[PDB]
Amino acid sequence: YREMNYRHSWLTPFFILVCVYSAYFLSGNRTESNPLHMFVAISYQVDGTDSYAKGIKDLSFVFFYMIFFTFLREFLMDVVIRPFTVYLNVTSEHRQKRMLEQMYAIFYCGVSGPFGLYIMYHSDLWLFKTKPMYRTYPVITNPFLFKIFYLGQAAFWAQQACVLVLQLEKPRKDYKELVFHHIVTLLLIWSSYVFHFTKMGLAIYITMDVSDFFLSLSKTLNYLNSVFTPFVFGLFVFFWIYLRHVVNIRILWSVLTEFRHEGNYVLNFATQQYKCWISLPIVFVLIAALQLVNLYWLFLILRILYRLI
Amino acid sequence: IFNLFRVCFISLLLIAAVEYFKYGTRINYEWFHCTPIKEPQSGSVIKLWARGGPSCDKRGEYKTIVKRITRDYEPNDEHLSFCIIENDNVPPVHYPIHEDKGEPGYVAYVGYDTDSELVQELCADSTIYHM
Amino acid sequence: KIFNLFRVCFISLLLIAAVEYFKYGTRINYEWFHCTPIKEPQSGSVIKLWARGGPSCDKRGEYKTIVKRITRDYEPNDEHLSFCIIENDNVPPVHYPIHEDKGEPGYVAYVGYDTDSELVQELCADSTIYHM
Amino acid sequence: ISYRHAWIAPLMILIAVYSAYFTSGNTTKTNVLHRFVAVSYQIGDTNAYGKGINDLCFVFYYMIFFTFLREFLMDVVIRPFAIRLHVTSKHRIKRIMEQMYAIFYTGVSGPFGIYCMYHSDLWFFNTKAMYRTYPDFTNPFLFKVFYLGQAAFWAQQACILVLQLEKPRKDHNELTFHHIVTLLLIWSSYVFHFTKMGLPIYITMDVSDFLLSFSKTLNYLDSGLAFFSFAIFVVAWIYLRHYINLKILWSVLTQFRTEGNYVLNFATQQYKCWISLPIVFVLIGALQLVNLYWLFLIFRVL
Ligand SMILES: CCCCCCCCCCCCCCCCCC(=O)OC[C@H](COP(=O)(O)OCCN)OC(=O)CCCCCCCCCCCCCCCCC
Ligand SMILES: CCCCCCCCCCCCCCCCCC(=O)OC[C@H](COP(=O)(O)OCCN)OC(=O)CCCCCCCCCCCCCCCCC
Ligand SMILES: CCCCCCCCCCCCCCCCCC(=O)OC[C@H](COP(=O)(O)OCCN)OC(=O)CCCCCCCCCCCCCCCCC
Ligand SMILES: CCCCCCCCCCCCCCCCCC(=O)OC[C@H](COP(=O)(O)OCCN)OC(=O)CCCCCCCCCCCCCCCCC
Ligand SMILES: CCCC[C@@H](C)[C@@H](OC(=O)C[C@@H](CC(=O)O)C(=O)O)[C@H](C[C@@H](C)C[C@@H](O)CCCC[C@H](O)C[C@@H](O)[C@H](C)N)OC(=O)C[C@H](CC(=O)O)C(=O)O
Ligand SMILES: CCCC[C@H](C)[C@H](OC(=O)C[C@H](CC(=O)O)C(=O)O)[C@@H](C[C@@H](C)C[C@@H](O)CCCC[C@H](O)C[C@@H](O)[C@H](C)N)OC(=O)C[C@@H](CC(=O)O)C(=O)O
Ligand SMILES: [N+]
Ligand SMILES: [N+]
């Protein structure tokens, strides 16, 4: 019993997840009155339309899906990702360990990436349109799939930050900057969701997801010692520039100008409208720190490109 | 594992603090948006109202007026006698960005017991409350 | 040793400030501690609202509780308000007794939205209506 | 010379503050130094003083003043007097220094306390005046000065204890608890009113400590008056810290609810209600139990 739990660390999260889900489905209620709905699914809904509000039960959804994502990551890595790496015949233990995380990130960013593209397509934010994120501010009520995306991503990033907090592996070289990146993920997601800046963070979710997907594909192919790595790395660097820099600079420029001139700009605490002259510096700082981190990583990628050319 | 508990506690404290900040700002928006004005007439009677931006609607003016009336004056020391007059000519939200503003939506005259005769004539036909 | 003294002084100052703020909040927000709002709905949005409490729930506490409930439970931004506060001049400001037989409240208010503002206007009985 | 005269710097600070305050002709509430030098909040010309933040500045400034007094007394008179009594042991000299400083402080405070009571309706430790005037928003000039000075002295003692300038002490255990409970009691019985109620406890503790320190000093000198001094001390102890404290506890039990008004009223800052009676009762019962423990120590010694 405990011997399996010592190595198969996903057994306890699997048990918790399966017991919670089985109890929720066996109860037969499947409504907001069911207090397992507070954890299993998104609770606050505005009447019958696909508009979902915010509240305390959104934190418990994050808490439960943190365990969900711990289970998913550990399960995939031990039974699916690791035998797949073994089938690739990797002769280095460290390279295999790195490939484990790289393929997990590939899966997460190839699932949530297209997820972000799909939810954006069903909105007015297609092709990272600058106007929509400030037209309807404050976005008090979130759409169904939109809120699911935000809540699941928040739970996943909180889970990753917690795992990083329980330092078990040796601190890698970018641990000084990756801890800052995790901190800024949690801060940005929690501030954008709580302070009704939820439409605007999708355009930053999507660039993140796509760039990370191609970044993890590049590391996976290099660790695999594949021959098709230069083409994939070129696609990665092109899309990295376009998304994390061109689109991010467009978003920052909208924060500079389109934050004021477009949409309601007068501060109103009564209506929970925070889009004013005070939130503009806060938002610009919170996104300019991100742009500085992305610029430092662009410098690293440029150094790599110069070395390999 | 104590680092995990500390990080989770700090994150939950930050979330709760920001939620309480939002709740208090929504509840007490008249403090941030409406600036009370006390224009004394004679004795303890003051012509009291508030001014601010568009966020200082009639609700904000009324809340600021009530807060000032029940705070600056102590009924236990002496029973109050005030009134609140509504400006029907303006919409519930009328204050512009410009510093000129306009006629306030809510105007209150609040005085003590010995000044009740002054506030009664100042309120004219408006209902006079006791506190 | 100096750091320990600074920490002890800071803890003592925090205790003093917390107790002073507790006193200030209790004095300013005594209507929350002593007065419990009572709502008697009469329509979709019209509710007859007053407060109940002990002798410390004076007319000032009743008025503060009524105004607080009207301005918190109703959102004029979503829909413009219409209410009126009616004095019960037959009772003193300290009318409320300690026992449960409180009696007629000193302050009673009818508050509702503008779609049913006719009911509020007819319930006020010539009292001035404070649109919000 | 400040290294071996610990009172040079406090004296310089005190004299600078006093000279700056006195040289200016304002010498009233408008002066900035009135926050520290003297009691600030006064309602008109009446002999009644309110409460406020400036009292904390007074507490800190007279904490510095009592630091100066504690160092200067020992450095100028107490230590030379101890040397004059042919005392040579380091422990004996050091303990006699603190005991004689306590003698002087208590013989200044306790008589001041009884004088302040004699000018009020609290004479003979009457429990009716405890709660009849509650809440006591304003207290007389002497009543507030005595309270704030005692608070400043006890805060200075607590700061000295925390500073652990001479850490090894065998009395540290109970003395630290006494200092903490004294600071808590003074601060609570000042901010939450009950200022009239804390004076009798003030007087009992001050007089009992005065006689205790007198008996202790006589014992250290090994004089023939030690037994008589200890006898009068124990008589005053059972009269003040036990009889009067039990009378005060009985007042908290049965007279706390009757006298004055018992209904809670946060609007008038009148906290004498049914959720404050347990707090005031336990906060004095703990002190009474510690006094009973010290009485057990006295009986073991006697
Ligand atoms: C590596 C990433 C992948 C990890 C996630 C994979 C999830 C697979 C499914 C897991 C099991 C959960 C299934 C649903 C159980 C709860 C059922 C329930 O109560 O109803 C569905 C619930 C609410 O939906 P509904 O009922 O339609 O609400 C309206 C009410 N009539 O529905 C919900 O609230 C569902 C909440 C799901 C939250 C997902 C969190 C992560 C989000 C990002 C990745 C998910 C992308 C999946 C593909 C999307 C393609 C468009
Ligand atoms: C590495 C660390 C990992 C930590 C994990 C979390 C990481 C960050 C994840 C991001 C999560 C974002 C969402 C968090 C909660 C947001 C709640 C919210 O937005 O509430 C808004 C609500 C007002 O609702 P709204 O519709 O805006 O207005 C209605 C009236 N017009 O406001 C309200 O008044 C609703 C009530 C809000 C109460 C919030 C309390 C927060 C603290 C709770 C402490 C206890 C938590 C218990 C569960 C967890 C622990 C077991
Ligand atoms: C470094 C030098 C300069 C230092 C400057 C100050 C720095 C620290 C600032 C702390 C701020 C918090 C304390 C003051 C808050 C504001 C209080 C105020 O404005 O006054 C309220 C009250 C008097 O008003 P009240 O009588 O209640 O109401 C009248 C009704 N119209 O006010 C009061 O009752 C205030 C009473 C304060 C002092 C009372 C305690 C005296 C004894 C202290 C003993 C030592 C400390 C003990 C600590 C606990 C034990 C460890
Ligand atoms: C061992 C000591 C233990 C003492 C136990 C009791 C604690 C008392 C507090 C410590 C000493 C306090 C000093 C005097 C009080 C200072 C506060 C004050 O307001 O002082 C009065 C004076 C200005 O007075 P004003 O307010 O203008 O008018 C009052 C009448 N309407 O303000 C001033 O500027 C006065 C400055 C000169 C004060 C001279 C001292 C007067 C006597 C005080 C009692 C004795 C304390 C010292 C004993 C030393 C014995 C050697
Ligand atoms: C051979 C003589 C020894 C006598 C000592 C055993 C005794 O002394 C006597 O009681 C006197 C004597 C008279 C007589 O002739 O009758 C007698 O009764 O024995 C003394 C203990 C008692 C005084 C008991 C007290 O402690 C308890 C009361 C504490 C109350 C709080 O403290 C209050 C304040 O503090 C607070 C800050 N507000 O023991 C000592 O502690 C002294 C020795 C001396 C030494 O040996 O050098 C030491 O430790 O230094
Ligand atoms: C331990 C790093 C190994 C990564 C890859 C194996 C490979 O990195 C190396 O190659 C190692 C290299 C050694 C060298 O070769 O010189 C070196 O590190 O210096 C990669 C280079 C880039 C990925 C540069 C990275 O490091 C920095 C990335 C920063 C982004 C942030 O993390 C974002 C996240 O934080 C957040 C969660 N969103 O892609 C290639 O280069 C493959 C080649 C193969 C070829 O040449 O044949 C190609 O396809 O072009
Ligand atoms: N303000
Ligand atoms: N209450």
Probe ligand 6: pick from A157, A160, A170, A219, max atoms within 8 Å of CB? A219
Whether D193 and D132 have beta carbons less than 8 Å apart is answered as no
Residue A3 included in any domain: no
In sequence order, the 6+-apart residues with CB closer than 8 A to the CB of A175 are none
Residue A250 included in any domain: yes
The alpha carbon of residue D270 and the mean position of all alpha carbons in its chain are separated, in whole angstroms, by: 25
What span, in angstroms and rounded, lies between the C-alpha atoms of A59 and A65?
10
DSSP class of residue C103? -
Whether D130 and D43 have beta carbons less than 8 Å apart is answered as no
What span, in angstroms and rounded, lies between the C-alpha atoms of D54 and D37?
10
Total number of domains constituting chain A: 1
Whether B33 and B53 have beta carbons less than 8 Å apart is answered as yes
Ramachandran region of residue A225, left (φ > 0), alpha (ψ -120 to 50) or beta?
Answer: left
How many Å is the Cα radius of gyration of chain A? 21
In sequence order, the 6+-apart residues with CB closer than 8 A to the CB of D59 are D148, D151, D152, D155
What span, in angstroms and rounded, lies between the C-alpha atoms of D114 and D120?
10
- Where do the H-state alpha helices sit in A76-143? 82-87, 93-121, 132-135
What SS3 state is found at C40?
A: strand
Compute, in angstroms, the gap from residue A60 CA to the centroid of ligand 2.
8
Cβ count near A238 (within 10 Å) = 11
Nearest-by-Cβ selection for A165 from B7, B28, B57: B7
Compute, in angstroms, the gap from residue A308 CA to the centroid of ligand 6.
11
What span, in angstroms and rounded, lies between the C-alpha atoms of A241 and A189?
22
Residue A36 included in any domain: no
Ligand 5 binding pocket includes D163 (Cβ within 6 Å): no
What span, in angstroms and rounded, lies between the C-alpha atoms of A69 and A46?
27
Beta bridge partners of B38: B48
What SS3 state is found at B42?
A: strand
Closest CA to C45 of C85, C76, C67: C76
Count Cα neighbours of A89 within 13 Å in the Cβ-side half-sphere.
1
What SS3 state is found at C132?
A: coil
Helix axes D141-163, D54-73, angle to 10 degrees: 60
Residue A12 included in any domain: no
What span, in angstroms and rounded, lies between the C-alpha atoms of B22 and B29?
10
Task: State the residue for tokens 């329509």.
Answer: C43
Burial class for A26, CB neighbours closer than 10 Å (0-12, 13-18, 19+): exposed
Whether D56 and C16 have beta carbons less than 8 Å apart is answered as yes
* E strands present in B1-131: 35-42, 45-51, 81-86, 106-111, 129-130
How many Å is the Cα radius of gyration of chain D? 21
Q: How far is CA D260 from CA A181, D129, D131, D264, D272, in A?
A: 63, 9, 5, 12, 9
Closest CA to A240 of A161, A176, A299: A299
Does the beta-carbon distance from B70 to C63 stay under 8 Å?
yes
Whether C39 and C111 have beta carbons less than 8 Å apart is answered as no
Probe ligand 5: pick from D150, D203, D219, max atoms within 8 Å of CB? D219
A270 is written with which tokens?
């009564």
DSSP class of residue B56? S
How do B45-51 and B81-86 pair as beta strands? unpaired
A86 is written with which tokens?
């073994």
| Closest Cα in chain C to D55 | C16
What span, in angstroms and rounded, lies between the C-alpha atoms of A213 and A220?
10
In a mutational test of the C interface, the residue from D156, D264, D266 whose CB has the highest number of chain C CBs within 10 Å is: D266
∠ CA(A102), CA(A106), CA(A112), 5° rounding? 140
Q: How far is CA A299 from CA A214, A250, D203, in A?
A: 17, 20, 76
Whether C116 and B77 have beta carbons less than 8 Å apart is answered as no
Domain that holds residue A57: 42-308
Whether B55 and A267 have beta carbons less than 8 Å apart is answered as yes
Subunits next to C (3 or more Cβ pairs <8 Å) are: B, D
- Structural domain boundaries in chain D: 54-301
In a mutational test of the B interface, the residue from A266, A269, A271, A273 whose CB has the highest number of chain B CBs within 10 Å is: A269
What span, in angstroms and rounded, lies between the C-alpha atoms of D252 and D282?
10
Ramachandran region of residue A139, left (φ > 0), alpha (ψ -120 to 50) or beta?
Answer: beta
D178 is written with which tokens?
């006494």
> For ligand 3, what atom is nearest to the CA of residue D158?
51
Ligand 1 binding pocket includes A178 (Cβ within 6 Å): no
Burial class for A154, CB neighbours closer than 10 Å (0-12, 13-18, 19+): buried
The alpha carbon of residue C17 and the mean position of all alpha carbons in its chain are separated, in whole angstroms, by: 26
Kindly state the helix (H) or strand (E) to which residue A20 belongs, with its residue range: helix A11-27
* C22 belongs to an annotated ligand binding site: yes
Does the beta-carbon distance from B86 to C59 stay under 8 Å?
no
Experimental method, per PDB record: cryo-EM
What span, in angstroms and rounded, lies between the C-alpha atoms of D214 and D233?
8
Q: How far is CA D193 from CA A31, A38, A279, C37, in A?
A: 53, 47, 44, 30
